[PDB]
Amino acid sequence: GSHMASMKKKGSVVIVGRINLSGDTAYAQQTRGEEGCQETSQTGRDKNQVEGEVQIVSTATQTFLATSINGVLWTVYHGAGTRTIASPKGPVTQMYTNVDKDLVGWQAPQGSRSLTPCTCGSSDLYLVTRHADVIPVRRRGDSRGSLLSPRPISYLKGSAGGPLLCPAGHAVGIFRAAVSTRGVAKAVDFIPVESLETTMR
Ligand SMILES: CC[C@@H]1C[C@]1(NC(=O)[C@@H]1C[C@@H]2CN1C(=O)[C@H](C(C)(C)C)NC(=O)OCC(C)(C)CCCCc1cccc3c1CN(C3)C(=O)O2)C(=O)NS(=O)(=O)C1CC1
Ligand SMILES: [Zn+2]
């Protein structure tokens, strides 16, 4: 537009729930409904308590996951773009933005818990989805892993930004894209945790 006075601003990313991994059962919890989400995206002021490692996040148009690792809440650029995140004190600007890696990060919210980067060098992995499914994945390269049991891409949609974990529960990567044939995901592409660690320097 040429009329700057009426140009709009995009809202903030808003935390609307979490994937609870604290007990013996993984389950999704919603912490904010759609009306409250819309309001919070506009103001960027979110006073809700944050807990856990894996957050469910939303914009006005999309919903996906974000994962705390080393004191940074990470997600995908294809979901968040350059948006701020809502926080108790107002919008918080990204501390990391890398379109080439499809990676963004903000300082981790107070109350969150961070995963530790994996140093195990192990190839037996576990992908956590927005529905709290824990999907076994065999690592197949730096940024790929195969599903032991393939799934329609519908099952994975909305889980970009979520973690791949090793057997000990360390972060191995951030889910980025599905490797799909005829709508069936046989594998996943992820941003390796080492790439996050390099971004942090
Ligand atoms: C459905 C579950 C998927 C996790 C998910 N992500 C996606 O939907 C991403 C977003 C977009 C497309 N895509 C794919 O997964 C596609 C697909 C299945 C849609 C057909 N696969 C593909 O292109 O494989 C090709 C392959 C060669 C394997 C790509 C590897 C390179 C990957 C790569 C490297 C560097 C930069 C970029 C990329 C890809 N990238 C930018 C980018 O923007 O990708 C999601 O759930 N998104 S979401 O619904 O949460 C959304 C709201 C956030
Ligand atoms: Zn590990």
Numbering used by the authors: 980 to 1180
Publication excerpt:
The HCV NS3/4A protease – a chymotrypsin-like serine protease – is a prime therapeutic target that cleaves four known sites along the virally encoded polyprotein. The NS3/4A protease also hydrolyzes two human proteins, TRIF and MAVS, which are part of the innate immune system, thereby confounding the innate immune response to viral infection. In this study, we report that four chemically representative protease inhibitors – telaprevir, danoprevir, vaniprevir and MK-5172 – exhibit distinct susceptibilities to the protease variants R155K, A156T and D168A. To elucidate the underlying mechanism by which chemically diverse inhibitors bind to the wild-type protease and drug-resistant variants, crystal structures were determined for 16 inhibitor-protease complexes. These complexes include wild-type protease and resistant variants R155K, D168A and A156T each bound to telaprevir, danoprevir, vaniprevir and MK-5172, with resolutions ranging from 1.10–2.50 Å; S139A protease variants were used except for telaprevir, which requires covalent bond formation with the serine 139 for efficient binding.
Against wild-type protease, macrocyclic inhibitors danoprevir, vaniprevir and MK-5172 exhibited antiviral potencies in the sub nM range (IC50 = 0.24, 0.34 and 0.11 nM, respectively), while telaprevir potency was significantly lower (IC50 = 1030 nM), consistent with previous reports. The acylsulfonamide groups of danoprevir, vaniprevir and MK-5172 were also positioned in the oxyanion hole, hydrogen bonding with the same set of backbone amide nitrogens, as observed previously for the TMC435 and danoprevir structures. Meanwhile the Nε nitrogen of H57 interacted with the sulfonamide nitrogen in these complexes, suggesting that the Nε atoms were deprotonated. In wild-type complexes involving macrocyclic inhibitors, R155 adopted a conformation distinct from those observed in telaprevir and substrate complexes to allow binding of the extended P2 moieties in the S2 subsite. This R155 conformation is stabilized by hydrogen bond interactions involving D168 and D80. Vaniprevir, with the P2 isoindoline moiety, bound in a conformation similar to danoprevir, making favorable cation-π stacking interactions with R155, despite the P2–P4 macrocycle.
